[model samples]
Each structure stands twice: as C-alpha cells, then as structure tokens.
Target: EVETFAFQAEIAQLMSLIINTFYSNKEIFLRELISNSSDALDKIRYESLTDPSKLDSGKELHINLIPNKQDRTLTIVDTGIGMTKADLINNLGTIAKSGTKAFMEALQAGADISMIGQFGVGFYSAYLVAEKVTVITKHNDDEQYAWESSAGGSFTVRTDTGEPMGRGTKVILHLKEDQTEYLEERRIKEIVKKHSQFIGYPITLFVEK
Candidate 1:
C-alpha cells in the first residue's frame, strides 16, 4: 500500500514562490540538484569515518546523469547518503523545517544561488522542467522506497521492490515538452561545468553516440 501526504501550508507558499518568482532562472534546476548530489556524496564520506561499515565494501562515491530521449526523461543517480521515508516527508513536504522565511529573504536580497541546497527547497525546482517526478531512494538504516509527485498539493510514497537498488537515490524527471533541452548532452555538460566544476566526486553523463 502507498501513503499520500499533503504539503504543509508553508510548503504551498514556497512552491508558488519557486514556480512563479523564480521563473527567470529555470535553467538553474540542474545546478540546484547537482549541488544536492555533491552535498550528499560529501556526507557519506564523513559518515563512514566513524561507522566504517557505512562505506558498504568501499563502494565508490559518484553521480550518474542519464538522459533518455525516447522516454522523454532525465535521471540523476547518486551513490550518496540516500534519505529515509521520514527524510522525504520532512524535507520535501515541510517548509518551516528549513527556514522558509529565510529562503524568501535570501531571494529578495539576491543572495548566493548555490545556497539553495542548504535551504532545502531547491529540489522542488525540478518541477520547472518536469511534469512529473519520481524519487527512488535507499538508505543504510532503512528499506528501499519510492516517492512520486507532480508537484501539486500532495505526493505519494510506496515500498519499491522491482529494482536492484542500493544505498543511494535516483531521481527521474518526466520532463515537460519545452524542457527537452535538459536531455541534451551538450546542455547538461555545460551546466555541470559552469556550476559543479570543483565538486569532489565523479559525475558521469551517458553520452549516446
């Protein structure tokens, strides 16, 4: 069985802020997610220091970018500190948890765009490109689960069993027609170079020749 959750009041307002006020910067969607990806990778590295086994056989930390033209989808896969169900609900559905008012203050003050990840609302920017979004994640302490949403008032979460998932997160964007540019190798490559060049982990994009 699946569970459905509604966004908290603050989250609704934040969504409107991102979809409307943040219109001009639609392209930063990639930059925002890559920031989150790198941050996650950074976390696992530190987490393994004390736990040791958290590395899971010394699995390499990295990110994968996959653009499927025929399917009209773009997938960002990260071998990082994937979230649990509570993480998904709290992070994505609750705005006050991460200072929603401060996010608006940062926007009005024209603060650094890179801080979006820290603000916790940047992940919703995926809606700028996608009509629908699916997140399948597995964490070391929990079982695998998948989250799906169209960025409306509510989203769904369910147990995932079909894929050979590991300790990481995979985000699939069923992109809107106008956002196909993101599915282009050249486009994302340039985005990564401009925004995430100094990231410590490896990010490999599947360039279909």
Candidate 2:
C-alpha cells in the first residue's frame, strides 16, 4: 500500500492561526511536538509486539533534537510510525472537526459556536515557531516522501531519495525570528520536562554547550 495526500484550502488558515494565535507562548510547540512523537512511538511499539514484521529494524522509539544556531534551525526528529502520502493529505490537510457539518448546520440554524474548540488538530500547530517546515519520513511499509509547507497559503509535496531513517520520521522546523527562544538548551529542556516528562521514550536535546 502506497501513502498519499492533498491539502485543503482551510489548512493554510489553520496553520497560520495555529502559528500566530492559538498558543500563548512559543515554548509549548516543542512540548506539543514531543508529546506527539511519544504517542507515535507508543502506537507502533504496541502494534509491533503482536506483529513483529511491522517493526522497522533501523529505527527505535526515541526522540532527537538537533539545534543549529547558524541556520536558526531546530529539528525535532523521531523514530516512530512514519506517515504515508495518504496519511499526509488526510491527517495534515483536513481538520477532522467532530460533527463539523452538523455544527455548521446548527450554527446556520442559530446554535452557538461555543463548542467549536472541542476537536483535535495538532499538525497545524507546527507553524507556531516555524517559518517553514520540512518533514522527511520513511515508513516500514512504503516509499519515502518529503512534505514541505509554510504559513503562507500552500504546500508542495514530492518524492525524496535521501537516506532513510529505516523507520519513523524527522520533522525539521526553521524557526522564525520571534521564536528564537527555542534555540537555547536550557529553555527546551525545561519545556520538555515541564510538559513531556512522563513520555515513555528518552527525549534528547542536541545543543552546543
């Protein structure tokens, strides 16, 4: 089975809103992404126990933080169930607003919009600190693909032939000027411990001390 995806128009606005408005502080983005990674690792690990063939030999359930001050790049890479093209489009593109259609119908019929925030949509949160995001992923079951996007309006996807992580994924965030606080080791460590301390896997932050 091959993975594939396509972005919806609302995705850009969602990304921008997540980047500019949703989070009160920029530090939460690291914790949010790390939590997501931990969840991914947990999901596949549980699945692999029942089906050994599902495991990717070269990768482990771990997290790696590579911070490069020169380029102002903060990459949070993970070895978990890497996404497929379909997973990319469906998961990353659409906001699975729970009963959104009914909610909209109710709104048009005069119901309140108070319940709008109940749904979960996490990927758009990447834009909080990233001026640009590049996701390099290879799944155990399919070919690898690179997904690129900005807070602007659209995203471009293409096949990548670079070195695969054997399993899981790597998400590189090119931090914006305002989000430079993420470049500091102390800051990231504190954020991780504060929010993601209970995560099952070891979270390592790469920095120049």
Candidate 3:
C-alpha cells in the first residue's frame, strides 16, 4: 500500500529557506548527500556490533555515483543502513528540529552559514539543483520503498515491487534544465574530492577515473 503526505511541521517554510539561501552554495548539495550516506553507513556499523549477523559478509561498504546525461539524472547509491517506511516520512517529509529554529533565523537574516552544520533540513537542499528527487531504499528489516517529491509542498512513498537493492539507499536527482552543470564527470569528482575526500567509506564514481 502507498501513502501520500502533505508537507507540514515547518517543511514548507524550510523549502523556501533552502531555495533562497542556498543558491550561492548550491554545490553543497553533493557534500550534504555524501555526508548523509556516511551517516547511514555509520549507523548500520554501530547497530551491527551487537547483532553481528547484520553484516553482509561479501558486501563492501561504499557509495556509488552515476551520472546519466540521457535522463538528466545523478544517482547516488550507498551500501548503508536503509530507511523504513516511517523513516521516509520523518526524514524526508517533516523538518526535524535539529537546530532548525536557529538555522532558519541565520539564513533569514542573510547570514552566510553552512547548512550541513544545522542538520535536519539539509537533505532538502537537493532542491537547489533538482526539479524532482527520488529515494528508493531497502532496510535490513523492512521491504523496499520509494520516496519521490517535486518539492512543491508534498511527497509520495510507495512500496517498490522490484527486487530489493539488497540493503541500503538510492537517491536519484532529476536535474532541472539549467542545472546540467552537475552532470559533468569532472565537476562531480572535484566536488567529492574537495568535501568528502576524508569520508570514512570509499566512494566509487561510475565513470572511469
């Protein structure tokens, strides 16, 4: 069964804030994504410590990047702790409080600040370059679910029937017409190197180095 949600709990406001404030720092979206993937991967590792069976013996922990010019999409696939149905709504729908109040005020005042430092709403920064975003994820204990949003104040989460991604999350950004610059291989490489070079997990770019 699928469910639709109306964005509330400061989410609508958060979108406006991200749009207006993050334009000058649009490339930070990649850094936000790369960092989030690290968080997801880190979560599973800690959780699996007590439940050793959670580790997939042969699966290597890493992030996969694919730039698709034909589709005008940039996809990030991670071997990490995936989200459950509820997580789709809480994490992607409503804006959780993590410094949200202060974060908004800072941006509202036209103060330059790092969004990732504020937490919570950073994921929505994908809107800086995407007309639409899709998150297809599978948790170790839950069925796969796909979360999609055009960032027009609502989102949809549907149960995915295809084969599971085994474990972890996949984020696909439907690039806006003018945001095509992010589709360049070298550009993405440069961004990753600058921000996520010291990340714990290895990140694999689908293109040849």
Candidate 4:
C-alpha cells in the first residue's frame, strides 16, 4: 500500500531554512549524502557480525556515483542497509525524533555555526541543488520501495516492482538549472576527493567516455 505524509511543521520550516539559508556551500550536499551512505553500510556490516547472512553472502559493498549530463541527473547508489516503508515515514516525515529543533535553537542562539548539521536533517540538504529527489531502496526484510519529494511539504512512498536492488539504496537527484555544475565529471570527482576520500567504502564514479 502506498502512503503519503506531510512533513511536520518544524520539518517544513527546517526544509525552508536548509534550502534558502543554511548550506550556502551547496557542494556539501554530496558530502552529506556520502556520509549517510557510509553510515548505512556500517549498520549492515555490524549486523552481519551477529548473523553472517544479514546481507547477501557474497555481494560486494561499494558506492557508485553516476552522472548523466544529457538527462541532468546524478545518481548515488550504495550497497547498504536500506530503509523499510515505516523507516521512510519516520525518518523522512516527522522531526519528532530528529535533532532539527536543537539545530534551529542553536541557529537562533548564534552558536558555533559549523555545528549546524549536528541534527539529522542532512538528507534534506539535497534540496540545495535538486528540484526533485527520488530514493529507491530495498531492505533485507522489506520489499523494494521508492520515496519521492520535491522538498515541498509532502512526500510519497510506494512499492517499486521494476527490479530488486537485492540490498541497498539508490538516490536520484534531478538537478536544478543552475546546479548543472554537479553533472560534470571533473567537478564530481573533485568534490568526492575533497570530502569523501577517507570514507571506508570504495566510491566509483561513472562518466561516459
């Protein structure tokens, strides 16, 4: 069953702040995304320690950055612990359990500005450049599902039957007109090297020859 939910009041306001105020250095979007991808990969790896079969026995773990200039899209794919339908609703919909409130309070208090994203709202940072974001994920226990939002007030989650990811998540960012710089191979490589080089997993970029 497909489900749709509105972002919480604080979340909606936070989205506006992220899109308009915070994250002025828009390239950090890729860094934040890679960070989350690494976290997800860590989660599944730790799970595997307890149950050897937690992830597919022999599947390799890695992250892929595919840029399509013609389509003006950048896809970030990770072999990691993907989210379930409920996880999507809870993680992306409400700010109740998130650090958004604290982040906002800090912003108002004029605290050290560098700590802005100590909250978990990093996912929404994609809005800095993406007009729309589509996430396709498959958890070990749940079927594949797609969640989409335009950083608008609401998001929708629906079952995806096209093809199974086996395990992991894929995020597709539809770039805004001015954000096309992200579609360049050299630009993406530089960003990844600067911000994500030390990441534990191997990150591969796909650029057409």
Q: Whose TM-score is greatest here?
A: 4
lDDT of 1 by residue, 125-193 (tens): 787788889999988888899999886678889989877577888999999888899989999999989
C-alpha lDDT of all candidate models, in order: 0.81, 0.70, 0.81, 0.84
lDDT of 4 by residue, 1-209 (tens): 77788878888887777777744578888998888899989989988989888767236778999998888899999989888888888855565335778878888888533354567767777888898999999999888999988877898899997777889999999999999999898999999999888999999999875
TM-score of each: 0.89, 0.81, 0.90, 0.91
lDDT of model number 3: 0.81
The Cα error of candidate 4 at residue 186, in Å, is 1.0
How should the candidates be ordered by lDDT, best one leading?
A: 4, 3, 1, 2
- RMSD (CA, angstroms), candidate 2: 4.8
Candidate 1 residue 75 C-alpha distance from true site, Å:
0.7
CA shift at 156, candidate 4, in angstroms?
0.4
Question: Model 4 residue 29 lDDT?
Answer: 86
The TM-score measured for candidate 1 stands at 0.89
Q: lDDT for model 2, on a 0 to 1 scale?
A: 0.70
Better of 2 and 4 by lDDT: 4
* RMSD of every prediction: 2.3, 4.8, 2.3, 2.1
Write the residue-wise lDDT of candidate 3 on 1-209 in tens digits: 77888777577677666665535668888888888899999988888889877877325688999989999999999989999988888754444654566677776687554554555556777888888999999898888999998877888999998766988999999998988888898999999998889999989888632
Off by over 4 Å in 1: 91-96, 108-118
Alpha-carbon error at 108 in model 2, in Å? 16
Off by over 4 Å in 3: 20-22, 91-95
Output the worst ten-in-a-row residue range by lDDT, candidate 3. 91-100
Question: Candidate 3: lDDT of 122?
Answer: 65
